[PDB]
Design a binder for this molecule. Sequence first.
Ligand SMILES: NC(=O)c1ccc[n+]([C@@H]2O[C@H](COP(=O)([O-])OP(=O)(O)OC[C@H]3O[C@@H](n4cnc5c(N)ncnc54)[C@H](OP(=O)(O)O)[C@@H]3O)[C@@H](O)[C@H]2O)c1
Ligand SMILES: O=C(O)COc1cc(Cl)ccc1C(=O)NCc1cccc([N+](=O)[O-])c1
Length: 315
Amino acid sequence: ASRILLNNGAKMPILGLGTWKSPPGQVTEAVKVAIDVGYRHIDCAHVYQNENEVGVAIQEKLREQVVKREELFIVSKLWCTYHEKGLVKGACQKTLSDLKLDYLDLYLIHWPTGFKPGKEPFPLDESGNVVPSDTNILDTWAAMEELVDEGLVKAIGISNFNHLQVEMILNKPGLKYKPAVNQIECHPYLTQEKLIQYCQSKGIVVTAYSPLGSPDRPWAKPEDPSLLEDPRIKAIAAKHNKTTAQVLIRFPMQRNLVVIPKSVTPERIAENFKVFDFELSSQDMTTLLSYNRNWRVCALLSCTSHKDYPFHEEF
Ligand SMILES: NC(=O)c1ccc[n+]([C@@H]2O[C@H](COP(=O)([O-])OP(=O)(O)OC[C@H]3O[C@@H](n4cnc5c(N)ncnc54)[C@H](OP(=O)(O)O)[C@@H]3O)[C@@H](O)[C@H]2O)c1
Ligand SMILES: O=C(O)COc1cc(Cl)ccc1C(=O)NCc1cccc([N+](=O)[O-])c1
């Protein structure tokens, strides 16, 4: 089954294309190829500074009569320097204009941490400390709600929120919209059982990012664990006559998660979609879950003093 039901009545494709680190030089072709081999879900963000070129590819394929807009599920995220109430609509409209779209299917608060407003996406002081803003999760949420009520986005959600921060929103007096999605890091080294359990028990759909371990993350150390090269996972792949990436993509799919693997390589975009023709076994699933090391690709020491830093909490 290709799509999962959101609490706003819309259906979200469970496999989408990630675009973080897809060079503007190469992401238009990536998205074009993706659409051609069946992707309908693209995960974007303003901070990825490639939304224009993503938009280029979508516009063309609409022009080519390959897909219709209603068939596409486009996601973007509000960046941290835009959490102020008065900045949210603008930030959304910039993303929309960049993507050459009239609406987004899903708009996420990218991180719970508000940063000092300005051009700089990551304002720092002088001990690697991020300069926060005097914003909070509740007021930002209300600003997102307004986006729905003005037709700019069909659904809103969060990303990198811990369970207490999700609770804050759920329990907000005067809540208009429940978050539809919480997009978090998830893979066999960070299996997220308690947070998934929590969100799923709230009717909030979970999207797994960095499902392949983000080998191209710009802060990688050669000593860090490498999922795509893990022998134990290669072994599971070979018994299924699939690649390790295919296994890493299929795994969250069988946990009722959405997954959004990134590639700019045409061969890999096509391969990564070919995951609806095999099933991981019960023994495979518990084996992969047992690799959890609580290891994060995405966690900034420069943010660990921010009041809304998400990862002090167990989950
Ligand atoms: N909400 C947030 O905070 C957040 C944070 C991180 C990521 N995300 C989203 O999640 C997406 C996925 O995560 P990610 O970009 O961190 O990393 P990922 O999807 O785990 O890994 C992408 C890396 O894997 C390589 N790769 C892809 N398919 C492969 C295959 N079949 N075989 C071997 N290598 C393969 C890619 O290389 P090539 O591209 O060179 O082929 C790229 O270097 C992002 O792009 C973004 O959309 C969201
Ligand atoms: O966030 C992503 O989607 C991918 O990671 C990116 C991508 C781009 Cl273009 C620029 C910067 C980052 C990054 O350092 N994200 C991590 C991060 C951010 C904010 C707070 C935190 N935090 O831990 O509080 C972590």
